[PDB]
Amino acid sequence: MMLRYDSLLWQCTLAAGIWFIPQDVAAISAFLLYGRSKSRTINQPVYVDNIDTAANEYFKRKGLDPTKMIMMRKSSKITEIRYGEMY
């Protein structure tokens, strides 16, 4: 077909992108911000220097025997503790 940069099809697409993308990104960002606001209040990430010391403290406070608790490292900076005897 005959395609031209100044065509209505291409120019409309550029006009739509310029007009809507700035609005959509702002609108999406605002929603993301609201989600972050609730997330941090419900469960804020907290950093611990040494996992082992924190894990031992956690077991002591909750009265959990470390033997029955499985510790795994999901990521480099993420370590997760799970119940070994869980259905």
Partner 1 sequence: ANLLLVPSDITIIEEKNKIAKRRIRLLEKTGLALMFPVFHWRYSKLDKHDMYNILRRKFDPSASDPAIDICRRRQESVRRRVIAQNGLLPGLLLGVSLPWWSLRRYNYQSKLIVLPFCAYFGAICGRIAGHGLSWRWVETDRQRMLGNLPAKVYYRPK
Partner 2 sequence: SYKSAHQETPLTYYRATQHATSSINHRLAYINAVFVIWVCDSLNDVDQ
Partner 3 sequence: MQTFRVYRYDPLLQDKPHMQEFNIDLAQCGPMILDALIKIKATQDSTLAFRRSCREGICGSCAMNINGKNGLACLQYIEPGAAPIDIQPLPHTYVLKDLVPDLSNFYNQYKSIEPFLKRRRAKQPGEKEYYQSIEDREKLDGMYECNLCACCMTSCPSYWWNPEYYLGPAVLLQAYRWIADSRDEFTTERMAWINDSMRLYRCHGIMNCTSCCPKGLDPAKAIAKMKAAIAAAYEPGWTKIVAQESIANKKRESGMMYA
Q: What contacts 81, CB < 8 A, 6 or more positions away?
A: 55, 58, 69, 70, 71, 72
Half-sphere exposure of 47 (CA within 13 A, CB side): 2
- Residue 11 contacts which entry, partner 3, partner 2, partner 1, none (Cβ below 5-8 A, type-dependent): partner 2
Residue from 1, 4, 33, 72 in contact with partner 3 (CB under 8 A):
4
CB of 36 to partner 3, least distance (A): 41
> Does position 8 bind partner 1 by CB under 8 A?
no
- Nearest Cα neighbor of 48 from 58, 36, 63 is 58
Q: Any contact of residue 16 with partner 1 (CB under 8 A)?
A: no
Question: Closest approach of Cβ 34 to partner 1, in Å?
Answer: 13
